[PDB]
Amino acid sequence: GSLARAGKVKSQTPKVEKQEKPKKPQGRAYMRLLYTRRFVNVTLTNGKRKMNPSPA
Amino acid sequence: DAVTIRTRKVISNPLLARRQFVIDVLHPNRANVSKDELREKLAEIYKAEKDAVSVFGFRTQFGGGKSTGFGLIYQSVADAKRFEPAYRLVRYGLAEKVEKASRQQRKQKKNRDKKIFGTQRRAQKRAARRNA
Amino acid sequence: GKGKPRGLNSARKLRVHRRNNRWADQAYKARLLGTAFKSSPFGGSSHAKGIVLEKIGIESKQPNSAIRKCVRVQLIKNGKKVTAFVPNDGCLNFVDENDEVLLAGFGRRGKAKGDIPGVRFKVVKVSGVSLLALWKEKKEKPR
Amino acid sequence: PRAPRTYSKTYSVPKRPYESARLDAELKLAGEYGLKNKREIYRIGFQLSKIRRAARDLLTRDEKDPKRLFEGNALIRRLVRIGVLSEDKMKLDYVLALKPEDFLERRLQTQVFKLGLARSIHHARVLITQRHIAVGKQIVNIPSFTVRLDSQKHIDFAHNSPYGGGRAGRVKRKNQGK
Amino acid sequence: ARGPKKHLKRLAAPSHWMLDKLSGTYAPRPSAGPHKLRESLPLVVFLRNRLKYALNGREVKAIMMQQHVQVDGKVRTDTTYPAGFMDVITLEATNEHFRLVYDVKGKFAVHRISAEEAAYKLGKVKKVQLGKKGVPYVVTHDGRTIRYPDPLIRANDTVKIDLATGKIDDFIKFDTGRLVMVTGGRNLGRVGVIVHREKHEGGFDLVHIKDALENTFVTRLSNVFVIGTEAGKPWVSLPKGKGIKLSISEERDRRRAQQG
RNA sequence: AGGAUAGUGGCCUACCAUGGUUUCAACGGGUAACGGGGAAUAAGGGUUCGAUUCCGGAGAGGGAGCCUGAGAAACGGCUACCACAUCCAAGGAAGGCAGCAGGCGCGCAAAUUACCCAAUCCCGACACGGGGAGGUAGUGACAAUAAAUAACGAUACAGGUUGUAAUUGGAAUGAGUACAAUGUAAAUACCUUAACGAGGAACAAUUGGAGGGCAAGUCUGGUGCCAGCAGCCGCGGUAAUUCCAGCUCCAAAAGCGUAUAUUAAAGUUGUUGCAGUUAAAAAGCUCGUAGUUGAACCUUGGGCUUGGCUGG
Ligand SMILES: [Mg+2]
Ligand SMILES: [Mg+2]
Ligand SMILES: [Mg+2]
Ligand SMILES: [Mg+2]
Ligand SMILES: [Mg+2]
Ligand SMILES: [Mg+2]
Ligand SMILES: [Mg+2]
Ligand SMILES: [Mg+2]
Ligand SMILES: [Mg+2]
Ligand SMILES: [Mg+2]
Ligand SMILES: [Mg+2]
Ligand SMILES: [Mg+2]
Ligand SMILES: [Mg+2]
Ligand SMILES: [Mg+2]
Ligand SMILES: [Mg+2]
Ligand SMILES: [Mg+2]
Ligand SMILES: [Mg+2]
Ligand SMILES: [Mg+2]
Ligand SMILES: [Mg+2]
Ligand SMILES: [Mg+2]
Ligand SMILES: [Mg+2]
Ligand SMILES: [Mg+2]
Ligand SMILES: [Mg+2]
Ligand SMILES: [Mg+2]
Ligand SMILES: [Mg+2]
Ligand SMILES: [Mg+2]
Ligand SMILES: [Mg+2]
Ligand SMILES: [Mg+2]
Ligand SMILES: [Mg+2]
Ligand SMILES: [Mg+2]
Ligand SMILES: [Mg+2]
Ligand SMILES: [Mg+2]
Ligand SMILES: [Mg+2]
Ligand SMILES: [Mg+2]
Ligand SMILES: [Mg+2]
Ligand SMILES: [Mg+2]
């Protein structure tokens, strides 16, 4: 087979810079962040619990 | 600031003409106590000559405020100079650090002399005759 | 009586029978015959370096349709020639003829992986630089 | 050469990496006790798993066996000493009934928070790590320090700490000194 | 391989010396001497690890080179001299006399004795036979050769050595009811009386010994050392514990009461 | 019977017999084989590994032969040959890193041509000398231990007396740097500790993933059976939950992924503990030696006295 198309899609993928965002806490602080986010201020949708709800 | 010295596990050792013990130093509000200052304090406590007192192996506990080491008190300065290691006497100023070449040079000189049989004077005299 | 001896003095028969029948286990058979030592291109090693002979595109098996971009590599340690897949989008451009590449298996332990036919190795490094580092522009190829 | 120095691992990872029931239980348990990571939970489970194994082996022996009486009493005594086992449960059958929360109760971090020296469990760990807490007259900066029963009453601020009668810290001296 | 070994690795040293693993690579190799390597205690271990008079191996050599240490009434300057069972160590500078007797835990106790008792020692008769010119002699457990012994003395008996003239004061015949210390095996250090000697021609004779607490144990005859003429009458002072083995539970109970 | 040996012995010689081992596997072959203490994994039983900190053996490029000595068939001793290889004025002479460090080569694969006898011990005529044995430091993400990367208030809001989501404060601290002392043979580092050392506390945590197995998107853009992903099942042919990216999220975290081997999973090696009508597998059928395995039967019952330990 022809080798001319190697890297075709990655080359033509439009470059998008990563948006600058505040650092997330590390170590014990991050476990604290996850714990509250999942067991203190519960965001369940009346028995519907989603980690990454897509916008809909 | 109010340095307190405690001695425990004291053993009288006339075999080496000394008394030996563990030293506990309480030095609150103080990084630690220098060996020179402990020898001065120990000499006053036990009314011995400063040069007959040897301390070593000190370590400060975690959190500070206390150190533990080992101490020796000899019956005389002469006894200390006889039984103390050389490196400790250099620490206390009772001896001069012996000056010798580095270990590499001493070994290399030793191996060069292994190639000569007899006196060095004869060997160099013979070499001069050969080259003249 | 289950077809095997049960007598208290039949340990020899039981021991010999198990020894004869472990040869039906290919994992045991390959270990004692030393097939990796004799037959494997790597000679039993996890990795092996080699020189790139040519860049070759290999058609994937059905039902997939693609050109799997591999290389022909001659191993330094024994002179054997193998085909090694060069992973990721566009990493074939990092690999040139007469380069020194470090190879490794696909993780199927001597079998081909996926739809790629007859290829049992992948390129890990080229010219002493990780192919992953080159792909993510962490490093540049020394040339 | 010199004799080798012994060392050993103090934890073990779960066999199944992804399990929502275990993942939620661990995170719930880490959040309550302000643990840094899952390895601090694996460590408790690992050391509790071998306490049970020792107790199980003795429980298979006959009662009044010299080894069961000697090592069983010693194992019970050690657990009672650190407060993990209650004084009315010295039977080697209650040892098997112990749970990981019993051990996490006895950490220095948990005890500092439960003694009122800290606002929260996460405030307790930073107080310990920053050399503010002393057990007896010794500064301890290890959060996992297991507090013994006789050491419980002597947990307090270090005498040379800003919170315990020491001088003002670096920040205050720079502010009031300007 | 080509000749005698001169080193001793720390891990390969006898366990009853109670040496630590990490202090170094080597251990003191005992010299040739009256006692076997495995059943001896070099003076460097005794003066530094036990008494802690010396802080290191350099200092113990300084101690012995000043003529302080005497073993069995003679000055020894060999830091690895193999002192052994029943040997007397004298440090007249400190006015101390020690006897190397096993304690019940299997190690050489630091057993101080009086000067009067330090004037003699006991030796187990290994063999009796005739020397040149037909002179009978006795070989004790510490390699001593005493000529012209009492014609009643036989093997496995214990003789009392004057230790200043090297002669035999008197002896104890090996028989039932004699006081015994065990000098080998896992019953090392225990003290009891002989109950019954069981003979095995061509093999090893076994001795049945009853403790003061009426505990009975069996050991090989080669590990039996007669130390007294009857129960409660030893010819030397016994170390603390009197060679009575306590179970680990009993020791734990005893330590609790001793410390409160 | 002798010889030889330190000594036993076909160890060797002379003479004489014809013996010795073997399906209970001799003999031969292979070993990517030094043996063991041990290591990994393991409900139990097991499977795999053990060049390598201790013990025993063997070797010093390959053989062989020796001197000295108590002890060597020694190689940092010698002699010879073979193979390598150095200087040479061409006549000759000198070699042995599987010691320490270091170099080349080989390779997937492994550190300083450093300091010291202070410790551990060893050697010597020896209290004193020597020791790349050993110790110290350097390199070192082999493995192992502990353990930072933030904590707490006030407003503002949402919220059900307090958990957060933001913009506002003053505290705390060690990473780092350093007087100094300690440490050490001398240092380094650790431990202590003046002065300095945190708001984007830029003193900025990574590695892999987000269809299922398997925890976490049916979000947005790009490509269009291409590029690629994908351990396996599969995804990709114009709204791709799987490719390339952004966002968000998940897992473990100073660690995480990949390759290979191995162990569990594997009751897929099964003694415990498999299967053999049809999925693989009862020899076509009998005989038969070794092997394995082999019916039942021979002092039982009764009586008296007594010691101890469990419950009371
Ligand atoms: Mg000379
Ligand atoms: Mg077949
Ligand atoms: Mg398929
Ligand atoms: Mg041997
Ligand atoms: Mg000697
Ligand atoms: Mg015999
Ligand atoms: Mg003969
Ligand atoms: Mg013959
Ligand atoms: Mg012949
Ligand atoms: Mg092996
Ligand atoms: Mg080999
Ligand atoms: Mg080995
Ligand atoms: Mg090899
Ligand atoms: Mg070895
Ligand atoms: Mg070589
Ligand atoms: Mg050679
Ligand atoms: Mg040789
Ligand atoms: Mg050499
Ligand atoms: Mg040699
Ligand atoms: Mg060299
Ligand atoms: Mg690490
Ligand atoms: Mg950081
Ligand atoms: Mg990421
Ligand atoms: Mg991906
Ligand atoms: Mg994606
Ligand atoms: Mg899921
Ligand atoms: Mg993957
Ligand atoms: Mg299918
Ligand atoms: Mg599209
Ligand atoms: Mg799309
Ligand atoms: Mg398996
Ligand atoms: Mg099956
Ligand atoms: Mg069929
Ligand atoms: Mg079939
Ligand atoms: Mg049939
Ligand atoms: Mg029968």
**Of residues D2, D5, D66, nearest to E249 (C-beta):** D66
Which helix (H) or strand (E) segment holds residue D74: the answer is: helix D66-81
- E252 and D70 within 8 Å at the Cβ level: the answer is yes
Question: Rounded to the nearest 10 degrees, how much is the dihedral formed by the CA atoms of B66, B71, B75, B77?
Answer: -100
Query: Cβ(E171)–Cβ(E157) under 8 Å?
Result: yes
Integer angstrom CA distances of residue A20 from A17, A23, E21, E247: 9, 9, 57, 72
What does the block give as tokens for B108? Answer: 């290399």
C-alpha neighbours within 13 Å on the C-beta side of residue E207: 29
Integer angstrom CA distances of residue B32 from B1, B71, B72, E69: 11, 16, 19, 40
Q: Angle, to 10 degrees, between the axis of helix D20-33 and the axis of helix A28-39?
A: 120
Say how far apart CA E148 and CA E151 lie, in whole Å.
8
Query: Cβ(E230)–Cβ(E177) under 8 Å?
Result: yes
Integer angstrom CA distances of residue D100 from D49, D85, D103, E59, E101: 10, 12, 5, 53, 51
Query: Cβ(C69)–Cβ(C89) under 8 Å?
Result: no
> Taking Cα atoms as reference points, which of E237, E184, E187 lies closest to residue E211?
E187
Residue of A nearest to D125 (CA): A28
Integer angstrom CA distances of residue A26 from E27, E200, E221: 50, 77, 71
Integer angstrom CA distances of residue E255 from A35, D73, E112, E175, E251: 49, 15, 23, 37, 6
Which nucleotide lies closest to D34 by the C1' atom and the CA atom?
F151
**Of residues E25, E248, E249, nearest to D2 (C-beta):** E25
What does the block give as tokens for B55? Answer: 């301390």
Ligand 9 centroid from CA C97, angstroms: 73
Give, as ranges, the nucleotides of chain F with any atom within 7 Å of a protein CB: 24, 32, 48-49, 53-58, 70-75, 106-109, 114-123, 127-128, 130-135, 143-153, 163-165, 170-174, 179-186, 190-193, 195-198, 200-202, 204-205, 208, 210, 214-219, 221-223, 225-237, 243-254, 258-263, 268-272, 274-276, 282, 291-294, 310
Question: Rounded to the nearest 10 degrees, how much is the dihedral formed by the CA atoms of E85, E91, E92, E94?
Answer: -130
Query: Which residue approaches F218 most closely, CA to C1'?
Result: A54
Ligand 16 centroid from CA B111, angstroms: 26
Do chains C and E meet with 3 or more Cβ pairs nearer than 8 Å? no
Which helix (H) or strand (E) segment holds residue B125: the answer is: helix B120-131
**Alpha helices, DSSP H only, in E37-195?**
43-44, 57-65
Distance from E247 to chain D by nearest Cα, in Å? 9
Ligand sitting nearest the alpha carbon of E2:
4
Say how far apart CA C89 and CA C91 lie, in whole Å.
6
- E54 and B16 within 8 Å at the Cβ level: the answer is yes
Query: Cβ(C72)–Cβ(C83) under 8 Å?
Result: yes
> Taking Cα atoms as reference points, which of D79, D82, D77 lies closest to residue D110?
D82
Residue E68 phi, psi dihedral angles, 5° rounding: -75, -40
What does the block give as tokens for C123? Answer: 């390129």
What does the block give as tokens for D127? Answer: 């107080």
Q: Does B57 touch chain E (CB under 8 A)?
A: no
Q: Does A19 touch chain C (CB under 8 A)?
A: no
Listed in sequence order, the residues at least 6 apart from B113 whose beta carbon sits closer than 8 Å to its beta carbon are: B120
Q: Does E216 touch chain B (CB under 8 A)?
A: no
Rounded to the nearest 5 percent, the helix, strand and coil shares of chain A are 30, 0, 70
Which one of D20, D24, D27 makes the best mutation probe of the A interface by having the most chain A beta carbons within 10 Å? D27
Which helix (H) or strand (E) segment holds residue B58: the answer is: strand B53-60
Distance from C55 to chain A by nearest Cα, in Å? 8
Question: Rounded to the nearest 10 degrees, how much is the dihedral formed by the CA atoms of E154, E158, E160, E165?
Answer: 50
Size of interface B-D (CB pairs under 8 A): 10
Integer angstrom CA distances of residue E147 from B36, D90, E144, E153: 62, 67, 10, 12
Residue of D nearest to A36 (CA): D31
Residue with tokens 């098997």: D96
SS3 of residue C84 by DSSP? strand
Q: Which residues pair with E226 in a beta bridge?
A: E180
Residue with tokens 């928070």: D113
Kindly write down the DSSP assignment for every residue of D90-131, as one continuous string.
Answer: -SSSSSTT--HHHHHHTBHHHHHHHTTSSSSHHHHHHHHHTT
Q: Where are the beta strands (DSSP E) in C28-138?
A: 47-59, 67-75, 81-85, 100-105, 121-126, 129-130
> Taking Cα atoms as reference points, which of C100, C95, C8 lies closest to residue C50?
C100
Query: Which residue approaches F232 most closely, CA to C1'?
Result: C114
Query: Cβ(B50)–Cβ(B71) under 8 Å?
Result: no
**Would you put residue D122 in left (φ > 0), alpha (ψ -120 to 50) or beta?**
alpha
Say how far apart CA D15 and CA B63 lie, in whole Å.
41
Tell me how crowded residue E123 is: count the other CB atoms within 10 A of its CB: 25
Pairing label, strands E121-124, E158-161: antiparallel
Supply angle C-alpha A45, A50, A56, rounded to 5. Answer: 75
Ligand 31 centroid from CA C36, angstroms: 19
Say how far apart CA E51 and CA E89 lie, in whole Å.
12
Q: SS in 3 state form for D2-58?
A: CCCCCCCCCCCCCCCCCCHHHHHHHHHHHHHHCCCCCHHHHHHHHHHHHHHHHHHHH
Mark A35-55 as b/e (b = at least 16 C-beta within 10 Å). beebeeeeeeeeeeeeeeeee
Q: Does E11 touch chain D (CB under 8 A)?
A: yes
Residue C122 phi, psi dihedral angles, 5° rounding: -130, 155
Q: Which residues pair with E17 in a beta bridge?
A: none
Q: Does D136 touch chain A (CB under 8 A)?
A: no
- D34 and A34 within 8 Å at the Cβ level: the answer is no
Which nucleotide lies closest to D131 by the C1' atom and the CA atom?
F173
Q: Which residues pair with B19 in a beta bridge?
A: B12, B73
Q: Which residues pair with C123 in a beta bridge?
A: C103
* E1 CA vs F63 C1’ separation (Å): 21
- E68 and B15 within 8 Å at the Cβ level: the answer is yes
Solving technique for this entry?
A: cryo-EM
Say how far apart CA E130 and CA E191 lie, in whole Å.
33
SS3 of residue D133 by DSSP? strand
Q: Which chains touch E (3 or more CB pairs under 8 A)?
A: B, D
- A35 and D37 within 8 Å at the Cβ level: the answer is no
Looking at residue A5, its amino acid is R
Which nucleotide lies closest to B58 by the C1' atom and the CA atom?
F182
Do chains D and C meet with 3 or more Cβ pairs nearer than 8 Å? no
Listed in sequence order, the residues at least 6 apart from E32 whose beta carbon sits closer than 8 Å to its beta carbon are: E82
Which nucleotide lies closest to D5 by the C1' atom and the CA atom?
F53
Query: Cβ(C69)–Cβ(A3) under 8 Å?
Result: yes
Ligand 13 centroid from CA C37, angstroms: 15
Distance from D81 to chain A by nearest Cα, in Å? 29
Q: Which chains touch B (3 or more CB pairs under 8 A)?
A: D, E
Ligand sitting nearest the alpha carbon of D1:
14
Query: Which residue approaches F120 most closely, CA to C1'?
Result: E24
Radius of gyration, CA atoms only, chain E: 19
Residue of A nearest to D28 (CA): A35
Say how far apart CA D164 and CA D176 lie, in whole Å.
19
Which nucleotide lies closest to D124 by the C1' atom and the CA atom?
F151
Which helix (H) or strand (E) segment holds residue B121: the answer is: helix B120-131
Say how far apart CA B45 and CA B21 lie, in whole Å.
14
Integer angstrom CA distances of residue E105 from E18, E29, E190: 12, 23, 9
Looking at residue E140, its amino acid is T
Kindly write down the DSSP assignment for every residue of C98-110, as one continuous string.
Answer: T-EEEEEE-SSSS
Which nucleotide lies closest to D175 by the C1' atom and the CA atom?
F170
Residue C50 phi, psi dihedral angles, 5° rounding: -165, 175
Integer angstrom CA distances of residue E164 from B60, D57, E69, E88: 52, 59, 16, 12
Which one of C89, C97, C115 makes the best mutation probe of the A interface by having the most chain A beta carbons within 10 Å? C89
Q: Which chains touch C (3 or more CB pairs under 8 A)?
A: A
C-alpha neighbours within 13 Å on the C-beta side of residue A51: 4
